[PDB]
Design a protein around this ligand. Structure first.
Ligand SMILES: [Mg+2]
Ligand SMILES: [Mg+2]
Ligand SMILES: [Zn+2]
Ligand SMILES: [Zn+2]
Ligand SMILES: [Zn+2]
Ligand SMILES: [Zn+2]
Lengths: 162, 162
DNA sequence: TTGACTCTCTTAA
DNA sequence: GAGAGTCA
DNA sequence: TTGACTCTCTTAA
DNA sequence: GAGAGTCA
């Protein structure tokens, strides 16, 4: 809600609830042929999810609290960042999973960045493979690799140069 | 159905027409602090665009030919790949700009790959900066770099571990 | 047969 | 990656 | 007040 | 990154 105190209270209530979610160990590629371990705090697959939480999409949740007798609601992963600017360079800030695990609500696995920065982590070589993200990746992106391109650049005649 | 010969004729007429688009020289990052040159064949900003071409969106065009009284229409960048498989690993193939310039229709700047592979090129370090794409990038992706993350992983209490 | 517009759709963050 | 409404 | 559902939206390839 | 309709 409006006051800093009320916002800190929301963050603290959220952390306490999420902190009771099951802690799931995930072994992940780091890049450079190395492997690490992340501890995700995973929201349950079905109701009940936890105090204040409700599912609005297959992998979308929202946190809600009643403050000043009014319901205040936020995307489940946005709560840690309620005191941060909500935009950067005119682009909306998004919650962004460093563990690439939607159900995870561990704030140590979240950052707050443009959707472009968010998406780009999917292809990052990872913290031991050359990640250059200023807020460093926790793992190699799940889509990192050579790809599966079906056909490369080509011409039939002689009209084009690279 | 169109025969192979008819498809080749469509590809040839498309190449003939695109080869008369203005050829624009662009200096581009290759990765590793190196600069290179790409020559894009750019569709005009407004009509007329060229024989067979029409704009269906701000940065979307289609190529249309009438063959034996039947109107055939394709996405304007898909024509080079009409003799290729249209899916791979259960995913639809997309035209993918290696020059990241939608107006460009240079087939030497296009490949044919999943939308995920396509998007991921936006963040690639480039052919001189560590590109691992099997069909190599022509340039560093426009979104490569440290990013502009507003807030990193953080907790107010001690409920979490990474 | 052709040009120049119009509309909505897909994907996965 | 989001916001908001309908019920009980 | 709290929970458990429903719906559509945003972005940029 | 796509497909398809209207009109002259
Ligand atoms: Mg993400
Ligand atoms: Mg692309
Ligand atoms: Zn996690
Ligand atoms: Zn990274
Ligand atoms: Zn080009
Ligand atoms: Zn590449």
């Amino acid at each position: 809600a409006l006051t800093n105190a009320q916002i800190l209270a929301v963050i603290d209530s959220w952390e306490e609830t999420v902190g009771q979610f099951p802690v799931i160990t995930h072994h992940v590629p780091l890049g450079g042929g190395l492997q690490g371990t992340l501890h995700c705090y995973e929201i349950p697959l079905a109701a009940p999810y936890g105090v204040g939480f409700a599912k609005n999409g297959p992998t979308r949740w929202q946190y809600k609290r009643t403050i000043n007798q009014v319901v205040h609601r936020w995307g489940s992963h946005t709560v840690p960042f309620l005191l941060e600017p909500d935009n950067i360079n005119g682009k909306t800030c998004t919650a962004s999973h460093l563990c690439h695990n939607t159900r995870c609500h561990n704030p140590l696995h979240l950052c707050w960045e443009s959707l472009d920065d968010n998406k780009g982590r999917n292809w990052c070589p990872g913290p031991n493979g050359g990640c250059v993200h200023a807020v460093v990746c926790l793992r190699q992106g799940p889509l990192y690799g050579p790809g599966a391109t079906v056909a490369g650049p080509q011409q039939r005649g002689s009209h084009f140069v690279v």
